[PDB]
Amino acid sequence: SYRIEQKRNINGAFPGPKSQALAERRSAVVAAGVASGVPVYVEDADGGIIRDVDGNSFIDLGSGIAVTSVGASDPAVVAAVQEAAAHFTHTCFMVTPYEGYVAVTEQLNRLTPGDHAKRTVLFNSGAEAVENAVKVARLATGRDAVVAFDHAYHGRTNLTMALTAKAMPYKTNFGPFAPEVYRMPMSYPFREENPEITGAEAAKRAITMIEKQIGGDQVAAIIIEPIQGEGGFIVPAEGFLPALSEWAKEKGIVFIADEVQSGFCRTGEWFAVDHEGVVPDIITMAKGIAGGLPLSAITGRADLLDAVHPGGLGGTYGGNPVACAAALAAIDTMEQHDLNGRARHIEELALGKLRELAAELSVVGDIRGRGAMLAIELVQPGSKEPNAELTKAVAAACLKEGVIILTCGTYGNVIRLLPPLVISDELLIDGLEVLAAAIKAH
Amino acid sequence: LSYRIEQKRNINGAFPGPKSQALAERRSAVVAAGVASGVPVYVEDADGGIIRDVDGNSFIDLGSGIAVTSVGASDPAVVAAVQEAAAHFTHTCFMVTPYEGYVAVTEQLNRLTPGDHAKRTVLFNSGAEAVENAVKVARLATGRDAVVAFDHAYHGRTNLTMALTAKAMPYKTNFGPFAPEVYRMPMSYPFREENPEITGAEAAKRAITMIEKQIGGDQVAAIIIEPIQGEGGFIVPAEGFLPALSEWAKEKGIVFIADEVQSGFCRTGEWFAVDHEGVVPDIITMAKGIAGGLPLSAITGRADLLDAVHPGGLGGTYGGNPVACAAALAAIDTMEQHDLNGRARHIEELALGKLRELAAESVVGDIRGRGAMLAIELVQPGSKEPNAELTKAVAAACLKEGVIILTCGTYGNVIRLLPPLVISDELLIDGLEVLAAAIKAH
Amino acid sequence: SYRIEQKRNINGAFPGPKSQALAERRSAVVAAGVASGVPVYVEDADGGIIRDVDGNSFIDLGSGIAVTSVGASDPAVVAAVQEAAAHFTHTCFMVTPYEGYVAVTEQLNRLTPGDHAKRTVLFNSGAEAVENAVKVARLATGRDAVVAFDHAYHGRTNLTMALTAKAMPYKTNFGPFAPEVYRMPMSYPFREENPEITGAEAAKRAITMIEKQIGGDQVAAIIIEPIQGEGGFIVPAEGFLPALSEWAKEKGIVFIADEVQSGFCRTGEWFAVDHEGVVPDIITMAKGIAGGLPLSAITGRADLLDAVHPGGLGGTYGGNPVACAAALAAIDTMEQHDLNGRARHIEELALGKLRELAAESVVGDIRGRGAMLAIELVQPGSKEPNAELTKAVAAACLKEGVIILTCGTYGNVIRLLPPLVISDELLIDGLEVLAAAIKAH
Amino acid sequence: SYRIEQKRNINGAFPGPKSQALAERRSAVVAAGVASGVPVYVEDADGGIIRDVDGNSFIDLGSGIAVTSVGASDPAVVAAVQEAAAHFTHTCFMVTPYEGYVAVTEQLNRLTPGDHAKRTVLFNSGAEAVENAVKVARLATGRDAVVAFDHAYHGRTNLTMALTAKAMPYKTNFGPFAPEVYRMPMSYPFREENPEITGAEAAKRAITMIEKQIGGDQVAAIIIEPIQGEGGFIVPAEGFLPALSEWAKEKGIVFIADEVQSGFCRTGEWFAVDHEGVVPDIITMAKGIAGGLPLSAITGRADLLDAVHPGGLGGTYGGNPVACAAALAAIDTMEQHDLNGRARHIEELALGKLRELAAELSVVGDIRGRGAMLAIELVQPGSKEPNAELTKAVAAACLKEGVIILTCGTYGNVIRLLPPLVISDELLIDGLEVLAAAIKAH
Ligand SMILES: Cc1ncc(COP(=O)(O)O)c(CNCCCC(=O)O)c1O
């Protein structure tokens, strides 16, 4: 049940007048480099629709980059936010604490993998979350080196840039970068030089390399996205993540899962690591956690997090009470409406339609992902060379028909589906039809 | 002015009370041990100058959440704005689907920041993110590496902002290695100058010569400084220091970044602390007071600098959140409607009055600050040696009597007044009387 | 013509009494970690022999890690050192200059590849040379990032550690390391996941990765050893180096060849890059340059090196006059006795005997050029490394009076680095002892 | 007794024809930037004379930057070199060891301060020596941070550049620099803002700053030149070095004395630390050690040096046998001819003549140093402002008269006397007369 009509509806040309008016204002005051993928301006976002200031209704297949999984306007979240704001907007937990912070931490304790003793701290952005996971790994182990992987993306602060693989646009001319970061090869099945390589073997490759080029006893943390997001929704071969987890335990290395994009029901489980039952030492979270309000978290082993001295982790806004109210509601919606189930159902629908399309075409290199985090990697016809041209084209074509869809990938050639998990089957099918049509058209 | 909850100090028996204790018990099972709070009671409502706890106790708020809730923790305008905006959409990610709130906030910041030259703005979530982004811009725009920060500086808890921060405990210990090419230079700190007669101009020459000999002016991307150093101890530089650095920075092509995260938005009696001396920074970093408690931060700077950054080079997921933007517009509106600059100047007069009366009745080393950002540096009796022990004592004493007051300083010996600017004279005086009684008592 | 008898001769058990005496003195005063691969102490080294203080004569198949290519006692070098020392040991070129420095510089200008304008600066160690190449790349280009490769070795200073791939023993617990260094995959034919990969394709793999993870216009320098030494005498597939060179030129990136181990006739050409006619923008040199005296150098494009401001490059000892005399003599000997030719002849002999051994399995790969050759040892019937056999063989060779070195990322490569003045007779004797040792284990 | 006539003799204009011929050759093949302070080319250097290729004889007041303390042509060194080279030029100690290495190490053990267990490793340059001291400190303590001082100079590798204070010409455009290096204030009496500050107080200032900005238990090493060379022959106030030493011991920090310039009799004692009886944990050496041949060393506590794993420290050329023969001879000459005594005698003569000059003038700011490591800091007439102009002038004037003298200093305004210790009284006086005349002339 929704608030605004859940149907795709484009009334004439866009951007419309009111959108154009805003663009004009924008170019006088916002930095030129801050671009938007979409030229229309939101007035309402709800269920699977973005409606613009000129009354056009677009299908939302990005959920704000995997943020509004509960929908951009979940009545529970809205209510929670409205009520909390009326009491106090901020007191800074480090100064005067409040129940919202604790309550959220209780939930994250419960929902994260593993049954061992865990603790949590809250911050605002995903970047902050990763920054804090690495601080904890470094302090708790007494070691320096952090290993990240090819195709990794972890943020836009200096260290998270360091941890991020792709240079354009995230890194160029923003260094020098935080030291003692090392990059290791990823399990990326579709582009392995030896297509027969298994996950275990891909892990052994990374491990040998870490051991020869750093030494296991020198590494503070291994940080990896269980499904790499911006890198192109790369899902590692079965057996890779457990092999890294087991080795990390053996060498005393903190294993950090970055579940900022993949966390909170997005993949059909509470966390992407749950597909393989990997139990990380620390997990970084943001995006979906608070239904669009700015909140992020790390939850990890009590012995690691409790090692940090008093006042060593924190920030001003972190664990904001309005954001916390949002999160508690958001999580509540995830449970009440079985969004894990909704995500699994989306996978079935969408992989269905996408595989039908593969069977007609050839420009479709690889279809992959889990739950509501799915992707199609587009290639040059008859080879494996990347096709970023087609990818830009298809996004634009979708936008023209009233479907907002995101792209990604190291080679710029991956279309990603990140619908809100509360999307209706009707809308999702409509979106997929538009997408399918667009690919065939170019 | 008019408030929602009774604006009187009122402590009903022992605290923490039962409901606060119940929350502390829940907390210790789920929140990291290191995340400590200065205050053992839990907020239910925060409004005007009162923090009221879950057990009905009403404390005087002399910290405004570390200079965040300048408009008050429950300004009706902010609340209304938040409530309305949340019902439309919580988040779409400005980099994907843009929205008026972002543009409007940017319009305001353009207008209110110093200088009449072309300026642009980008929005993020935390102060740390802001500083991170100011430095990215300086580095990209100038093509240089080095960034100079000062003794007693504080800029944040990400790896780079830790690098920029001077004090190691608790902000840095065991969290490195730190981002490279950061250099530290001496501050104008009148009360502790080895030559008490040194002028601001001379203090600037000292820094400048040192920068030139140890880096070289043409190698420095940015000089970053807090016009009044916050966590360092509300250190106000001698008159003539800031303009000398500004002038030299212009001469050498160095971006001059004013970190106005704590001092910005009326806190000091002007819109920005740099306005006291008419310094016009090349970039200014903002957060805290900007959005009346909601999580928002910003950089506003020369258009030619900010527009230099390539498309998609600056950003983030949550940044410039629409609910936070609504809050900011309302917060700024309240600052104008109720002349909080004026209120801040009036607070300066009242508080510096009472504090100087106390000095006249010796443990009071130095009284300093501007507006609603004031401090008393406490020393050992009859000398200049720091007195952290008395400082902790006084803060505890004040808490006991129902006044929440913050401390800071490189040497742990500074009591800081950061009341909300909407505080009543009656409450402020009560608070200052309690503070003055506490100092005399220990 | 040699000075000491060029025959292998072990008189009983070693270390002998005089060597033992020195070991005892050593353990009181030299840091415990500073270990030597050989337990006997030199008194004379000449041609292909190391003779110890107890009169034992070992075959020298390491030349001091590719340093004494002209021999550890070339009469020309000796004479030149002796004469130059009697005039002055040092004045510091940056203060009072001297002909020796200029002369050496003239030679390096001539002997290095390319006909473009080149300039040179002199230092002491290979690490210093690499450090200074990178300084020049960084200043000249105005960029930060430097790319090195898997299996690289470039030195023991903080930055050259940073550039070096292998952590044990060169890096462990010595960081944090100098920033903006990126590591890229090497062309290592024997261990490519796709055995059919060509040099051109290996280059494209590296180039795409550099471009995606740094950006070509952000890279100050690409630094590579034409034949990777400590990494295991890895020779890249044909077409790899020229591809990197061409791309570097396209993107304005300084291409640094590290010819510290491979330079000066060691591979059969003046420089290892000459095999493929690659012309580097800067080349780093040490080791063989001065017949054992401490000297190192960078020689590169005049426009790059002249970009550096006055007094930006230097050091105290650098371009020491005694070392310079030694270098002029050493280079002279390389020409007069055609050591390039001697090196090529050594390749023929040694690859011959090594391939015979492969016939009759533990021999994974035989590779190298000139007097820089290697055999990579593997577990019987697979490609798994065999460091155990490698240590064993080295020890077995030592026992029989042959000093031979090991190397490799996986600790499983026997390397031949004989002095280029070695006699066929001695070399064959050494190779027979080596072959015997491999068969024995 | 000497080999070439020990008298100043300039025969007409220079550079002469043969020198000019070499300059012409040079400019085609040596990098432009590699400049020499002297335009004539050496043929022989012996005792206190540099004789050029055109037969001119200059007084040598630099000893090759404090290298040829025994003279540039000590017969013992020459003989030793000649004999050693005939046996073998190099075998690489890590491969095939040799007596020369061990013997040198035996000497350095004996001559360095302290009676505790010590060990030594040998390298080639001073930079390499400092690099290795820091490796050891880091590996042995398991900590990262290294503190160096204002006016410090330690070398031209990336890390030793990091450690070095002055940017022109040593650092400009050569970064980014090795991380975790922190800079602390030096005891520099002549330019202290409080002229009455004691060495103990200067130490406390550094220590409090290290403690507040890094934390003692985070610092691997404190590295300092007992007399700062390139920084301007700055001699710290009495009590500074022992204070740092005592504190380092308390906090488990390796105290590294960089005696590369000041070591081996240069200051009138075997090492400059011997003036105050400071016993360093490691000491770095080069220059004088081997009478002009390239050799350098670290000698320090056995427990520190032996902590390094097998093969962790080394290099190809390091501890070269010809250089070792030179060293054993050089050290032997230092003892046989009591160069400590000669240095002390030089101090008396030179400080005498320099103080006479001070009494006539005013442009002489400060006279300082010990032994044969002495300096005069030149200032603007009647003030303390630096006088680099006069300093360059005086060096050129001295050169014109046939006296080669060096300059240095953070501010470019210090004349330094680094004569070889085997210089005759007659020659030294002649040189000082020329210098005194030059200062009076400009
Ligand atoms: C996997 C993963 N980790 C961290 C982040 C960073 O989170 P925040 O932007 O700081 O909240 C992300 C973000 N991904 C979306 C890309 C946004 C952008 O700015 O381009 C992530 O996926």
Ligand SMILES: Cc1ncc(COP(=O)(O)O)c(CNCCCC(=O)O)c1O
């Ligand atoms: C001057 C100044 N700059 C940056 C910050 C960082 O802002 P955020 O806390 O990341 O939003 C601050 C903040 N100061 C409050 C100290 C925070 C703490 O963790 O103790 C600042 O003052």
Ligand SMILES: Cc1ncc(COP(=O)(O)O)c(CNCCCC(=O)O)c1O
């Ligand atoms: C290729 C290459 N580059 C630099 C070096 C360093 O030379 P120096 O030892 O600094 O003079 C080297 C050195 N190779 C020998 C390494 C042995 C060791 O363990 O030090 C090199 O090969």
Ligand SMILES: Cc1ncc(COP(=O)(O)O)c(CNCCCC(=O)O)c1O
């Ligand atoms: C005090 C001190 N420590 C180290 C060095 C470096 O020695 P090397 O030059 O690398 O052997 C020095 C060197 N000082 C001479 C400066 C000459 C120059 O490079 O400009 C030193 O004084």
